[PDB]
């Protein structure tokens, strides 16, 4: 019974529904932006989410996201700038997150992120401290708030909930709230609340986001070095794999 | 009978009601973002925008911004990074520009900005060149789209109609369009068109904005060239002045 | 593989993800209004429409309707109004239907209705001309439009495409259009464009709902008569039965 | 000092900004409705509200209104109903109330509303008894919630305190709350609270609007005695004159 994919109606009802709900809360969703790279499974053991669908409420790993930019910004760089230029450029998501679901634990080497809630409310785990990088030194300015501990309660996917154990601050972000940062080599994960009657609808700004991924396998390179660049890792080898590609039957 | 300041009075009312209008759209606009620096006034010849009022459809140079974002995006960076990082960042703004103003003709040397048209339409101009930097190379990917001409009959600001000579390039933005990227060193202006029955509202993502102003007069800096680093070049001499602080009586 | 009912997981998708959209739309859905008499099948052979799905596009008669005012407007009338009370009241409900599916034709003795669209574009079909009652003298001022004839190439639910024949009149409305009304005795029905990106969203806003349905089955009857007093005449007999009540299985 | 009326660019800032935020929160508004009579003051003491003007919070009695429709609902009535028609009909507006300011106390005799709070929070103050008519038995079914008790500190307008004596329930209502009904005869006024950050934005759905104003001076009566028919009682006199008609300068 262990589902292996998603059929192509599951798939098209969960993504055109969450693109006509991004339209409603007046986020620019072009049709190209529509795809099969926007519904995201972290996994195969992850499909199962839809043996009783997105709005069980159960812990599993699979999002939406909706990308209306993601540019370089490289233009018009001092060429010294070149080998630093991956950790800058510009990247605008949506992001939807149904009832019990989760954005798996991760953190990018590269990318910082801010968040901005739109509908819903979304509950943020994660690491103050940064995950240091094999001799180098690196800047600070603001590091990141302590936050409080967890909530009694949260029900996480099952066969993962060991990803978890790091992200031990937390927060509970609402609509209104000021712009919530996410530095850098920071782990991260976030969900829906399970009672949620509405989807968790999430505005993300951040730097470039650097993904070979499915629909992303077609665009030219700013600068060398960025060609097949990789910039997300994981804390689950299992979310790793089906992160690139959603199979559809 | 020139105009030297805006009263309290006139300020208020502007800007409360630009926050409202924001709040309505879904903007995160936070008490603190809606201070005597939103409204902004380029140059003391401007302020007779407020003669007639904002819905007079006069062109003049005036317009609104309340910022919820301005992430110098620094920590995690490698040391090596401390010399560009000024040209990254994130800055998230909402822009609001009352029939026929304009937000006035400009370049910035290291911010790279984005629109996205929440209300209203949004008529761009700009230069499809970027203004070369004395004695240095820089990195080019995709340039800028060499646009449109003019259409006729666009009504420009008494006394700064040769500022804006240079932008010859036009494009007119809508809700729902792709994203619009302005790089940085390119000269633009942007207005609302002067027949439009509501303000023009703009989600504007770019990356760090540095900016000594009135408002932003008191921030510890993320690195030491960062402090008093201006990134802001007005065609109009006329311009710089009054962009700093408005003249509230 | 005549589907005759709805899978408890495909009702609940179906109307808690419009539930979320009109919410985000900013219609006030409170907890009540979500349930299993919300999402509407007009008939046995309708049930086919969840054979591929609500974004099939494909032409079947099955709506949703939020409820958040049905008021009798009794109170405070002089005791002679009792018998004529009917035709009043106020009723304010959320309407969404998916690409291709229709509000099948049908009128009302005593109910006029209204449309405001809120999302997506509405095809509304209908007879200029009233259902002329037995042997009564009725009252008229501002009568029906003749509006437009149909547009080519419509698509209509098999084996119901003549129920369709009488209601020749057709306008197209869209967000922002004047509120258009539908006087009490006109054939009516409406569907979203089959190439629709959106659920058909429609604010309606009429007299006096009376409907012994499954979820109204359980209030106090303001006046003797109306008590079991139904409202509701559509074209197709097959469209009438399961109106009042959605096999979910 | 005592403002006597308003001037051509204080109404303006006033009506226009006002249709931009409605138009914001998906109202549809349309060039017809922004007229001179959106802009409503009750009585020459209340344009002191523009000597310091709509955002000093101040306690005054003026209001804005854009109305969608004022539907008489008369046609396809049995002849019969002639009489009691004046009670039905279907009229949808959208109210906009500024910090501190009021809808003054006042009755109907035939009209019946309902509100839908869409931004901000409504004070409302109402008589939880209908006024009695002389000699003539009214119907009953739901009468209307007795509510709670005033809560303390509210600021009324100055020289009309007396006026909201009898208006002891109190009720506030929020974005989301289910739909609230007004009766016909009950006495009634509301306030946005004096912190509010936002204007007070309202959907209202209630029977047809009998109301021979200045913008209300040209249409056809459905029916002989709806001519020149007045359904507004203000408890203050002070309030009724100017109810008709802003005095624009
Ligand atoms: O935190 C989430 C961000 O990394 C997103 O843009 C995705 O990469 C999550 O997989
Ligand atoms: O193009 C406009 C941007 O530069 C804004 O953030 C302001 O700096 C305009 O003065
Ligand atoms: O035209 C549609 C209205 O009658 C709705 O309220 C429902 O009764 C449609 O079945
Ligand atoms: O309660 C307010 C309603 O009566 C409105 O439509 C206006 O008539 C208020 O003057
Ligand atoms: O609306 C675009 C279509 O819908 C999405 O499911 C994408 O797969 C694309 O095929
Ligand atoms: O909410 C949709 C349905 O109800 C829930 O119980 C899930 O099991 C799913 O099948
Ligand atoms: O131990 C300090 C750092 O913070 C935690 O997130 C760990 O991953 C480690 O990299
Ligand atoms: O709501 C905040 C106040 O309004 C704005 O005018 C700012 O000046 C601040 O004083
Ligand atoms: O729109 C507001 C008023 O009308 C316009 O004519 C301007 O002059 C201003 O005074
Ligand atoms: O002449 C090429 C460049 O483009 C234009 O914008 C000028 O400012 C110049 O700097
Ligand atoms: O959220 C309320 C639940 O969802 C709807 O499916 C209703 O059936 C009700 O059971
Ligand atoms: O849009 C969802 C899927 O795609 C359409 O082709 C329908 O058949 C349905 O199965
Ligand atoms: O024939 C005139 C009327 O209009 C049409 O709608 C028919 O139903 C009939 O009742
Ligand atoms: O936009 C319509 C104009 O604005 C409002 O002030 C009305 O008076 C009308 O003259
Ligand atoms: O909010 C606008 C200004 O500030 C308030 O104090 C009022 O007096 C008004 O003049
Ligand atoms: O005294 C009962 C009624 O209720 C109150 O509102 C009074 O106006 C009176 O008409
Ligand atoms: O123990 C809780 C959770 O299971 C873990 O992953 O993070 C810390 C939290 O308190
Ligand atoms: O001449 C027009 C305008 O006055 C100038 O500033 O830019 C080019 C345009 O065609
Ligand atoms: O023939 C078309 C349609 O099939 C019918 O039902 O109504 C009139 C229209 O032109
Ligand atoms: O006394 C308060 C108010 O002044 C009056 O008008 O209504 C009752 C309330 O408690
Ligand atoms: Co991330
Ligand atoms: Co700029
Ligand atoms: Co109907
Ligand atoms: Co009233």
Redesign the pocket.
């Known amino acids: 019974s262990a589902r292996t994919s998603i059929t192509?109606?599951e798939?098209?009802?969960w993504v055109?529904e969450a693109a006509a709900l991004g339209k409603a809360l007046r986020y620019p969703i072009t049709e190209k932006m529509v795809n099969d790279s926007a519904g995201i499974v972290f996994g195969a053991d992850q499909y199962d989410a839809f043996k009783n669908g997105m709005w069980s409420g159960e812990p599993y790993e699979a999002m939406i996201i909706f990308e209306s930019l993601n540019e370089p910004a490289v233009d018009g760089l001092p060429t010294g700038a070149a080998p630093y230029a991956e950790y800058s450029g510009l990247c605008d998501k949506l992001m939807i997150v149904h009832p019990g679901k989760f954005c798996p634990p991760h953190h990018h080497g590269r990318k910082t992120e801010s968040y901005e809630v739109v509908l819903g409310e979304m509950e943020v785990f994660y690491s103050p401290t940064p995950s240091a990088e094999s001799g180098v030194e690196l800047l600070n300015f603001s590091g990141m708030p302590v936050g409080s501990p967890w909530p009694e309660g949260v029900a996480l996917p099952k066969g993962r909930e060991s990803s978890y154990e790091k992200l031990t601050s937390y927060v509970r972000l609402r609509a209104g709230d000021p712009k919530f940062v996410m530095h850098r080599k920071h782990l991260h994960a976030f969900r829906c609340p399970p009672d949620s009657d509405v989807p968790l609808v999430v505005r993300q700004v951040s730097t470039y986001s650097h993904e070979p991924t499915e629909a992303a396998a077609g665009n030219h390179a700013p600068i060398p070095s960025w060609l097949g660049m990789h910039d997300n890792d994981f804390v689950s080898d299992a979310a790793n794999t089906g992160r690139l590609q959603t199979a559809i039957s």
Do not use: H, P
Request: proline share 0%.
């Open positions: 192509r109606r798939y098209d009802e055109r």
